[PDB]
Every structure is written in C-alpha cells, then in structure tokens.
Design a protein around this ligand. Structure first.
Ligand SMILES: *[C@@H]1O[C@H](CO)[C@@H](O[C@@H]2O[C@H](CO)[C@@H](O[C@H]3O[C@H](CO)[C@@H](O)[C@H](O)[C@@H]3O)[C@H](O)[C@H]2NC(C)=O)[C@H](O)[C@H]1NC(C)=O
Ligand SMILES: *[C@@H]1O[C@H](CO)[C@@H](O)[C@H](O)[C@H]1NC(C)=O
Lengths: 49, 55
C-alpha cells in the first residue's frame, strides 16, 4: 500500500482465519457450508480482488 | 454419480469405515454428507510456469 516497508523471510505457521462462535451455537454447520460455497463459486475471488 | 458415492467417500458414507485419511480435498458437496476436520495443507486451482531465464 505504501512502498516504504517490505515483507521478508518465508511464511511459517500456516493457519486459517476463521469465524469463531460459542460451542453451542446452532449456526456452525450452515456457517461452514456457506463459507465453503463462497470459496467454490468465486465470490471469495471477487472480494479478494 | 447418480446419487451414489464411490471410492473413499463411498466407503465412508455407508459406515463401512469410520475415519478416512489421505489426500482428500475439502469440498462443499462432500461436506454435506461427510464431516471434515481442520485442514493441514493448503490447495487450490493453481498455476505453474516454466522458469524463464535471466535477462
Ligand atoms: C441450514 O440451512 C438449511 C438450508 O436448506 C436449512 O434447511 C432447511 O431449513 C428450513 C427452514 O430453515 C426448513 O423448513 C422447515 O421450517 C419449519 C419451521 O416451522 C419446519 O417446521 C418444517 O419442517 C420446514 O421443513 C427445512 O425443512 C430445512 N431442510 C432440511 C433438509 O432440513 C436448515 O434448517 C438450516 N439450519 C440452521 C441451523 O440454520
Ligand atoms: C534458457 O537457457 C538455456 C541455456 O542454459 C537454454 O537451453 C534454454 O532453452 C533457455 N530457455 C528457453 C525458454 O529457451
């Protein structure tokens, strides 16, 4: 964004950003299914771009 | 295939094998009938290029 700072090295500790919720929340399964569907159809591509 | 699962997922859905490990892609269609776990190695529809020479 600014071209005054630079990343360096090689990425380590590969993890995934995730939407956390209380363990008893009934929305878990559908949240995961919708997030996978968003990954598949390319909506995540559009949001990234 | 015609509302029938085959292969690894086919042998797991019919509860002839509890857990399945290997090179399995997390997918939306598979998550409907089977329950996955947290991924350990990333993947996707990637592109590779022949290493061009220096100029
Ligand atoms: C996750 O998303 C699912 C998307 O299909 C959804 O399945 C379907 O949800 C609708 C309503 O949410 C159900 O419709 C039912 O709603 C009335 C409520 O008064 C029931 O009495 C009826 O039986 C009516 O069928 C669908 O039945 C349901 N389909 C299936 C196959 O279950 C889930 O409900 C969503 N779950 C969560 C936790 O968000
Ligand atoms: C790169 O240089 C090598 C010579 O070491 C050559 O054989 C090769 O064909 C060159 N690459 C391409 C794409 O031509």
């Amino acid at each position: 964004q600014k071209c005054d700072l630079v990343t360096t090295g090689e990425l380590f500790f590969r993890s995934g950003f995730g939407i956390g919720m209380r363990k008893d929340s009934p929305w878990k399964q559908n949240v995961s299914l919708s997030i996978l569907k968003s990954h598949e159809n390319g909506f995540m591509e559009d949001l990234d771009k | 295939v015609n509302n029938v699962w085959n292969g690894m997922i086919g042998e797991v859905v019919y509860q002839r094998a509890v857990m399945a490990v290997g090179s399995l892609t997390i997918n939306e269609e598979r998550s409907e009938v089977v329950d996955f776990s947290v991924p350990f190695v990333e993947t996707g529809i990637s592109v590779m290029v022949s290493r061009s020479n220096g100029t």
